[PDB]
Amino acid sequence: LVHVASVEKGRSYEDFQKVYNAIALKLREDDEYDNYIGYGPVLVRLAWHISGTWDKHDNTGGSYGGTYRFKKEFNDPSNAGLQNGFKFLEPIHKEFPWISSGDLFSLGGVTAVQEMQGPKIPWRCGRVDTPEDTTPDNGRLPDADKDAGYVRTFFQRLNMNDREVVALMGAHALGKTHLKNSGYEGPGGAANNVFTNEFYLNLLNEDWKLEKNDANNEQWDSKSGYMMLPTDYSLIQDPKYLSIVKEYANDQDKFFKDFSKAFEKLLEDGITFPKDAPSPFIFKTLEEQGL
Numbered sequence: 001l002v003h004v005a006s007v008e009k010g011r012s013y014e015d016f017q018k019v020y021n022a023i024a025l026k027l028r029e030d031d032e033y034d035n036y037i038g039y040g041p042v043l044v045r046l047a048w049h050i051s052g053t054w055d056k057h058d059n060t061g062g063s064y065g066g067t068y069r070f071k072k073e074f075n076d077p078s079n080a081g082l083q084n085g086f087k088f089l090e091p092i093h094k095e096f097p098w099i100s101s102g103d104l105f106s107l108g109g110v111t112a113v114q115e116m117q118g119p120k121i122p123w124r125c126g127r128v129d130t131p132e133d134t135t136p137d138n139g140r141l142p143d144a145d146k147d148a149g150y151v152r153t154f155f156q157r158l159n160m161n162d163r164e165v166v167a168l169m170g171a172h173a174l175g176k177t178h179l180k181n182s183g184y185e186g187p188g189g190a191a192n193n194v195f196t197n198e199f200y201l202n203l204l205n206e207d208w209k210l211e212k213n214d215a216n217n218e219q220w221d222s223k224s225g226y227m228m229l230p231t232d233y234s235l236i237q238d239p240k241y242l243s244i245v246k247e248y249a250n251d252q253d254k255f256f257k258d259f260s261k262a263f264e265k266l267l268e269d270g271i272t273f274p275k276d277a278p279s280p281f282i283f284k285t286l287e288e289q290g291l
């Protein structure tokens with residue numbers, strides 16, 4: 001498979017900035033979702049899940065085809081809870097019916113990060129909706145009950161190295177696990193709808209205790225009311241992952257620079273950009289626009 005990016009016919013930067021502004025105005029407005037966390041964290045989990053299906057060996061999966069719209073992907077056990085993010089984006093797709101699905105699902109993750117005060121993520125348009133039979137089978141997304149070796153090996157399929165896995169994992173400062181979606185319960189920090197390096201500071205400064213939860217799964221819990229998944233706690237058990245955690249715990253700007261680069265790479269894997277294609281767009285936030 002090759003997947004060539006094709007710009008939506010006749011669309012330029014200003015059209016995409018209007019789709020970004022529509023997502024971001026609706027984030028401001030529907031602030032009550034999930035105990036006033038708001039939809040920003042489930043929107044960056046939807047952009048990572050429609051991208052995380054990619055396989056570097058045969059070029060299948062990834063964000064290009066927008067195949068989450070199909071039942072098989074939508075109903076994947078690992079995607080439980082993402083229907084909430086889908087339902088959010090749906091009025092915005094009726095309002096801009098020209099944007100492809102993979103372009104809308106991935107821009108939602110870009111808008112969410114930047115509106116939650118995170119780094120600017122460059123975004124490229126050009127994903128094309130592909131047919132129902134291009135939809136990846138369930139099972140390509142990661143398990144949480146595992147160790148640092150599993151993590152390294154899993155992310156190699158999407159060819160992410162150590163620095164990219166640890167930067168990418170910092171998004172677990174956001175939102176929370178929900179027992180009915182994943183068998184895990186609780187948040188990773190206090191500021192869970194603002195993008196900061198808090199996940200690394202909690203992982204290095206809290207007194208974590210291993211406990212089973214009401215679903216019979218293990219997680220690392222702290223006195224403060226936070227939790228860490230096994231795969232999260234892995235990052236301090238591995239010597240290589242541990243120096244990087246320390247680095248970001250001490251430098252939020254390095255974390256932001258590295259998260260920006262890795263998350264754009266995750267969103268573009270499996271896609272070929274012709275050099276006639278437009279350069280990546282840097283979208284202004286509502287605040288930068290006075291809106």
Ligand code: HEM
Nearest residue numbers: 041042045048081142143144168171175176177178181182
């Ligand atoms: C080995 C890797 C990963 C595993 C096992 C994993 C697993 C999970 C699990 C079990 C949840 C809770 C789902 C729920 O109950 O609603 C979760 C939530 C979340 N994940 Fe991950 N994750 C991984 C990687 C990532 C990456 C790379 C990103 C983003 C770049 C990410 C972003 C999020 C976000 C933002 C949430 C919170 C969503 C919400 O509040 O509803 N995760 N993850």
